[PDB]
Ligand binder design. Structure first.
Ligand SMILES: Nc1ncnc2c1ncn2[C@@H]1O[C@H](COP(=O)(O)OP(=O)(O)O)[C@@H](O)[C@H]1O
Ligand SMILES: Nc1ncnc2c1ncn2[C@@H]1O[C@H](COP(=O)(O)OP(=O)(O)O)[C@@H](O)[C@H]1O
Ligand SMILES: [Mg+2]
Lengths: 577, 463, 41, 193, 315, 159, 193
């Protein structure tokens, strides 16, 4: 807690003297109020503080104290149902204290230091704990929150508290070296929480949308990236893959964006509904929120706060989904930080280390056996937005180098009212080769072959749309108007999906496989039929087509009974011509 | 009880250094008394233990080292504000420039703004009519929104500025019935204007009667550049005061954000530091976000701030950093065009590249009228495929089109000179919509594919 | 279309490079102004 | 000093058709003319100074060649002022700092020209000021800021460039003088990129 | 021993140890934090009064009161042994499979000296990939270096793994071959993700291709200096094998885009004017000192043959 | 170089069309040269010794292996000689200033030994004044019979 | 030094069919081969090394692929110069400074090459010097300049680049030596932009 005074102010750069021994990149309290800055460039005796807020008003003479720790997140119970900002401060209690403004000098704690949690111990006094071992749980929201040893400390244990009802400042286990372990603990936000084995992608991240798990899978632990133009239904897909997802803790990171583009989130994302209770969604959600005029280092550090919080929930054994929104905004926050440190830019004004930082973000993401002895993952759906539709912008190019799946969202499909507005031409997935045996042993045995059949049929429709554009759909050959008709029924019942309809929203693998096989069986008997005994108008006018069109509006509890009737009716009604 | 730091050394261009000043805060305002007695202004940058630095506002001519002294005033920059200032003009710093006496400031506020709390910001929900029909129908300004006007150089952006200034009102008729009282204000920050544009504004406001609810922060080009930096801070803090403590609906019009960014680039070069992309400073995005994100409705407060910044794109590109970052914080743009202006069309908005990202949650049932978004979509797509048919007929010949393309040709050409070529009249929103349906009724029913059935049943068949 | 987009990427490259040389020379001016008027004599 | 700024409602008749028809300029108006080398700036401004309907004309050659000032000295007094019967050289003051005459005086040239024009405005005349190559004055500022070791802005120009260009171009504009009778300075500035 | 203390100044990746006259230029130090976290660093610019240590990794937790600087092993050396074949290492030679580490048969410098132009002979023979248009139309003579210029979305890693796990030398097409000529692949995968890493793990452990390859996976969340050193460790191991046990070592350097980006990142510390697209001026030199180490030697029987794979960033 | 030598070979003034009277004074030639190689210098010297001009021409040769800063003196040498011979002995001098790109690089070198803040592409901020102080020492004088006519040469870099 | 310098009137028979027919180069001549990668540029330097009419050939490679130099050492002593008989290696002096050999010496490598070619010029031969990658020499001038902390110009290169490169190419030509017997040295320079 080394303390000195100010000897120079210039903008946000405060050269403060009298600090021999402040460790570099500590954060420190400037002034009598406490403006939190960080310590750059120790020089002899002095130390150059970079203040987050604006420094209008400080005099030469005010004391600087050092907190002693680097940029610290505070992990512990009570973090859920929370709206933080980029340096983990709760915006709700700042609203309760200081009206409607984030006034400078606000000191609030991340976790409630005045809320009792119902402790339940799970070690005996006498045992030996190491890092990442569970030592007792807490009922948070119908949610057995666990309490872990921080990742360094180890030893035996006397004096575990009994099953009381405590607060987060209470030492609950007291090791043999003093060493009183509280419920919570800090962690530096720029270091990976260490685990024992990063596993390998064997298991799909079941999203719910039957395009983004059938055609372009993302494989829990991996990494997806989406661009967002306007109108393309960005928010509805983000909210639908937080709502109907697989992973049971959701962390949303809005990393500096338009204020009215995130106040819709803050007035709509709480009032969703978790479809496992019927209760709210925020009982499994952390929501880090930044507008643009919040200070630059908060916007720079927000995705690190988000990934470190989601690693903490990974370390308990829960599947975690992280949606880091508009990483191009984070990139230009980093560009401003590079400008004030007097660095030579890269291609555009970005620093040299841009791909290093984005790799550090998207590579703390993966299926894992934790230090406790159980699995988890931090699968990232991290979005991007070029300001011009202008891929080979450096941020989007580095993102597409290190992602695993990439999902375009054309507004043109949203203009033609095709939701989810994913484009199956520009998108791609690199996890189809690893998810092969999981499909072959859990969904169905032939699954990837009819996946590839549908994918190349889309390829064919998109290929010979050309003389459809030159001539028209009604004067083709007869085996090519068939291709565009089955391509149309694929687009209008297997890809298009009403996210508000209560049963069309969620679609598992058995249901998507049934719809998929049903369309493919219709096509493989119609292409055999068009050369022997039927016209085209004696095919497209046939009342099984309405049953394939209704097939997605079927509860999965009553689907396979409908699938049997539909398949046998296909076989009969194509026998009947 | 003043305290003159005399004992200054090193005047250079704008800068001057004071020897022993450990009392001046960073970012103070100071009086620089000459040898003869003319007082200048300065802002304290870079206070240190062995000297302090002052950036002089105005010219440095009478200054020497013997008889020159600085003196503190108001060690962080404040504005003395009242409700009374609704008939007054000011010059950047906030001193009256119309001969009426100084206001009695019931509050004093820091001109740099505290940022709003996103938990305490509800979402923009209701509209604000501007009279200009190509705005009010196809991309509606709603309350709590910031949308800029991407001028060119030669285009009359100042005239459409003054027209929205003296013509915008809310209208409490067409909401749910909402206490007509609902007072209204226009804060008008013209930064970096000429003398000619200034006399234009202080005649254009005085002739109608619309200076009794506005407030004008005008500075000329030959005023100090640091006053021009302070100007949108002054305007936004008056507006934010008014709207969130006296329930006003404030519209704020920031003229010439290009001149703001140029003054920002030159002061950033005076601060002895290093620029960023294309020569503009590094922190330009944050410094524009600081003065655009001070707008919006608030949960609980009745008031609302709406923000139209009017900016000239330098050499007609949206990939310049000024329209780049402005359109990258703000929501939509409306964009003037030299083509309609050379054909002679006032106001020359073309609605094809224009966009409001927040119309869709501001118009419709109960807010303005039922058919609004459908009418706007149909107008946009019909004019958009009228334009390419016009471009096509210069080679096809008018004979070899069908009947239907010919009807789109007549639609486009009567659209851009009855719906857009407004003149200087005031089109309230229903006059705009009846001209909209009269323009759509040069097309047959069922060609109007976007509009649902009842509106085509009810409003079609006019003019 | 690809020839013009190639020429555009070429011109964007040379303009960015001259900007990079300018923000090198600014660092040199600032270094030589500070290394005199911060520690001379 | 001045008593009042008016607003302009009388054009500056150049004589050239495109200027006085398609892009007119009023009597108290600034007006700027950029162009590449060999594009027709100096010929344009000589025709402006030879045919406009101003009373007196101040020609500031600020960093431009000398044969095209000796042109004005030799072939003006053969001409005749269009408004009255004097020769043309009786109505032009001619301030001329050429290229190889020393480099600091270009700033002085622009200011001497504009303050002479303000004097003949205060008398009551209607002065036109054709000042060419303001970018040569910007270059003069660049060279002396090189000597000063100030930090440059973009392209090398010192940061107070635009402040001084505004402080010069705002000195025009159709005033009611201190004496009580009106007058005007119009400024045509040639800009060479 | 002899921990220099008395650090005067720490700024970016740089620190100025004063009273360091005993440090050689280009020596390697390790910086000891007050918590005990050591780091690598290299002496650059040793004056009469201070040395500019460059910290390769971050300078986080460093301070001026309680920081020490040791001096570890003036030239970056490496311990190599012929029982490396069949084992996967780090970017810097830490083993990552749990098999116990290497006892060094020899410890040898990782820069490598330049070959003497009168000592090199000409590349003569032929090695066989499996690709038909690499074997017949182009032809990979052993001893040469030739790159694979992939693109953005093209499969480069699939072809890397294929012509790693199937490429053989066949001496029976000529005569006299001593038919089991000792062959080995050094696969240096730099700047790769976790998915590509697990792909290469399973691709080499399927067939027997790992049992004759050395692996130098880099897993791109490491410090950038490991990405710099990965081609040098690979070519040191390959030069050892090929010039002391007469192998025919085939080195595949996986992503030379990431090596040069790492180079641009880490070589910004010395603040020079950079070259064309932000890259350093000396990048011809630094690409040359790892591409030129291929080549055969007159008087030995062993060869090194490189395939550097790199993506044209735009095409 | 061939067009400049051709001009200086045959450039004559016509008094048949002006009424001056014949009295024909031909041209003195001040031939300044800055970084010519040998291959152009042998061309100009063979050209002049053929057409009989080395009896009226003063040559200021700075070959490209002479040190690269006395190019800063060479145009001023040639123009001081030209100003003398024109304005004090009534000649009709023609000055050929070969390849000013070499002169302009000769002062980019000096102006970047002084860290003087440049214009565009590295050339210093004051170069317009130096090219002005060379070029504008030409023209005629009222009251005298002398003249200086300049043909400078440029080799535009990427043309 | 030389006595005086004759002008060239005699071709340098490069032994190709485009570079002696379409674009010839005389005996005391200077020529440049600029070329991007993968466009030969080294096979042509070697065909100039073998098939010429030079009496000796100084092949200087500075900053270039090492396989080039070992091709020239292995395959030249089994050729035949079509002028004397005997191995073609018996007339070439080759100064190699391979790309990984240290970067400061490839400044001096060019000068050592041109001095040895001038010595065989003064013995009265028709020498052909072939510098390979003068752009890598210029890169060496850059790396010794930025080490010396200079202010660069036009992509990092020091502004005396053309001074050095011009004085290099100037040493060519056909002279009569100080002994009175004549002789020439031609120079072909490879540029890799
Ligand atoms: N109105 C005009 N009438 C005739 N010739 C003109 C006219 N305007 C320009 N020119 C020609 O254009 C050339 C450009 O002259 P000048 O104005 O000196 O170019 P710059 O734009 O470089 O000043 C002159 O030689 C002149 O012959
Ligand atoms: N040691 C030096 N060697 C060469 N040029 C220098 C040196 N010092 C300064 N200069 C250049 O000369 C100019 C000197 O200006 P300055 O020293 O401020 O005033 P003065 O004009 O009186 O010398 C600077 O702009 C710089 O570019
Ligand atoms: Mg001119």
């Amino acid at each position: 807690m080394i303390q000195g005074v100010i000897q120079k102010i210039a903008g946000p750069a405060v050269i403060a003297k009298g600090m021999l021994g402040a460790r570099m990149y500590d954060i420190c309290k400037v002034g009598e109020e406490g403006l939190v800055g960080e310590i750059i460039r120790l020089d002899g005796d002095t130390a150059f503080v970079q203040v987050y807020e604006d420094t209008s008003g400080l005099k030469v003479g005010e004391p600087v104290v050092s907190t002693g720790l680097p940029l610290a997140v505070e992990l512990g119970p009570g973090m859920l149902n929370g709206i933080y900002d980029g340096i983990q401060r709760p915006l709700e209690r700042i609203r309760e204290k200081t009206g409607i403004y984030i006034t400078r000098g606000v000191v609030v704690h991340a976790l409630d230091r005045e809320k009792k949690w119902a402790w339940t111990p799970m070690v005996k006094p006498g045992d030996e704990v190491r890092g990442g071992m569970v030592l007792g749980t807490v009922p948070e929201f119908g949610f057995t929150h666990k309490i872990l040893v921080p990742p360094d400390v180890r030893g035996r244990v006397k004096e575990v508290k009994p099953a009381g009802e405590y607060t987060v400042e209470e030492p609950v286990v007291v090791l043999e070296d003093g060493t009183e372990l509280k419920m919570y603990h800090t962690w530096p936000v720029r270091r990976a929480r260490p685990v024992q084995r990063k596993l390998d992608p064997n298991t799909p991240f079941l999203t719910g949308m039957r395009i983004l798990d059938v055609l372009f899978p993302v494989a829990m632990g991996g990494t997806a990236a989406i661009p967002g133009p306007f109108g393309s239904g960005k928010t509805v897909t983000q909210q639908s893959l937080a709502k109907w997802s697989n992973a049971d803790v959701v962390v949303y990171v809005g990393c500096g964006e338009r204020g009215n583009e995130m106040t819709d989130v803050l007035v709509e994302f709480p009032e969703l509904t978790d479809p496992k209770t019927g209760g709210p969604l925020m009982h499994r959600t952390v929501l880090i929120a930044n507008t643009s005029n919040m200070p630059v280092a908060a916007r720079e550090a927000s995705i690190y706060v988000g990934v470190t919080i989601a690693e903490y929930f990974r370390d308990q054994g829960f599947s975690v989904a992280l949606m880091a929104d508009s990483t191009s905004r984070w990139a230009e926050a980093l560009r401003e930080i590079s400008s004030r440190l007097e660095e030579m830019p890269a291609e555009e004004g970005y620093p040299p280390y841009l791909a290093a930082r984005l790799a550090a973000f998207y590579e703390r993401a993966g299926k894992v056996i934790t230090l406790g002895g159980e699995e988890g993952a931090v699968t990232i759906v991290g979005a991007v937005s070029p300001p011009g539709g202008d891929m080979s912008e450096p941020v989007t190019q580095s993102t597409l180098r290190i992602v695993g799946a990439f999902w375009r969202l054309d507004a043109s499909l949203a203009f033609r009212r095709h939701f989810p507005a994913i484009n199956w031409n520009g998108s791609y997935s690199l996890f189809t080769s690893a998810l092969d045996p999981w499909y072959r042993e859990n969904v169905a045995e032939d699954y990837p072959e009819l996946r590839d059949a549908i994918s190349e049929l889309l390829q064919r429709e998109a290929g010979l749309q050309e003389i459809v554009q030159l001539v028209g759909p009604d004067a083709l050959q007869d085996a090519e108007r068939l291709v565009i008709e089955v391509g149309r029924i694929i687009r209008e019942d297997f890809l298009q999906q009403n996210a508000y309809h209560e049963v069309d929203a969620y679609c598992s693998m058995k249901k998507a496989y049934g719809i998929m096989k049903m369309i493919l069986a219709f096509y493989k008997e119609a292409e055999a039929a068009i050369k022997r005994g039927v016209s085209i108008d004696e095919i497209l006018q046939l009342p099984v087509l309405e049953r394939i069109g209704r097939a997605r509006y079927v509860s999965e509890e009553e689907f396979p009974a409908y699938f049997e009737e539909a398949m046998k009716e296909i076989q009969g009604a194509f026998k009947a011509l | 009880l003043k305290k003159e730091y005399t004992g200054i050394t090193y005047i250079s261009g704008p800068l001057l250094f004071v020897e022993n000043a450990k009392d001046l805060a960073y970012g103070a305002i100071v009086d620089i008394k000459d040898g003869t007695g003319r007082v200048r202004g300065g802002q304290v940058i870079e206070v240190s233990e062995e000297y302090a630095v002052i950036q002089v506002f105005e010219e440095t001519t009478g200054l020497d080292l013997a008889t020159t002294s600085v003196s503190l005033v108001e060690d962080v920059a404040r504005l003395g504000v009242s409700k009374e200032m609704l008939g007054r003009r000011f010059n950047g710093i906030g001193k009256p420039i119309d001969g009426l006496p100084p206001i009695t400031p019931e509050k004093r506020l820091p001109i740099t703004g505290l940022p709003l709390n996103p938990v305490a910001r509800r979402k923009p929900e209701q509209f604000i009519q501007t009279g200009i029909s190509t705005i009010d129908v196809m991309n509606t300004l709603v309350r709590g929104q910031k949308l800029p006007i991407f001028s060119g150089s030669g285009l009359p952006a100042n005239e459409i500025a003054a027209q929205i200034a003296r013509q915008a009102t809310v209208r409490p008729d067409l909401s749910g019935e909402g206490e007509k009282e609902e007072p209204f204000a226009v804060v008008f920050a013209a930064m970096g204007i000429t003398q000619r544009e200034l006399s234009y504004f202080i005649q254009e406001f005085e002739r109608t009667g619309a200076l009794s609810r506005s407030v004008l922060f005008l500075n000329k080009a030959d005023d100090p550049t640091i006053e021009r930096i302070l100007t949108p801070r002054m305007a936004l803090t008056v507006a934010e005061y008014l709207a969130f403590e006296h329930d006003y609906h404030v519209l704020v019009i920031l003229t010439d954000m290009t001149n703001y960014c140029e003054a920002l680039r030159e002061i950033g070069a005076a601060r002895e530091e290093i620029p960023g992309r294309r020569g503009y400073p590094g922190y330009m995005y944050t410094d524009l976000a600081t003065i655009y994100e001070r707008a919006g409705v608030v949960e609980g407060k009745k008031g609302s701030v709406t923000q139209i910044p009017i900016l000239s794109m330098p050499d007609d590109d949206r990939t310049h950093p000024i329209p780049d970052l402005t359109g990258y914080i703000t929501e939509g743009q409306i964009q003037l065009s030299r083509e309609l202006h050379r054909k002679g069309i006032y106001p020359p908005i073309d609605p094809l590249p224009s966009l409001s990202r927040l119309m869709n949650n501001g118009v419709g049932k109960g807010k303005t009228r039922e058919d609004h978004k459908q009418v706007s979509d149909q107008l946009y797509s019909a004019y958009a495929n009228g334009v390419d048919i016009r471009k096509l007929v210069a080679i096809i010949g008018e004979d070899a089109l069908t009947e239907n393309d010919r009807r789109y040709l007549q639609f486009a050409d009567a659209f851009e000179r009855f719906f857009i070529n407004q003149g200087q009249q005031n089109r309230s929103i229903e006059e705009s919509l009846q001209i909209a349906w009269a323009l759509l009724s040069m097309l047959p029913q069922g060609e109007l594919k976007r509009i649902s059935k009842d509106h085509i049943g009810k409003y079609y068949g006019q003019k | 279309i690809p020839g013009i987009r190639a020429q555009i990427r070429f011109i964007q490259q040379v303009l960015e490079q001259r900007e990079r040389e300018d923000t090198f020379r600014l660092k040199r001016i600032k270094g030589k102004i500070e290394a005199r008027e911060a520690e001379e004599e």
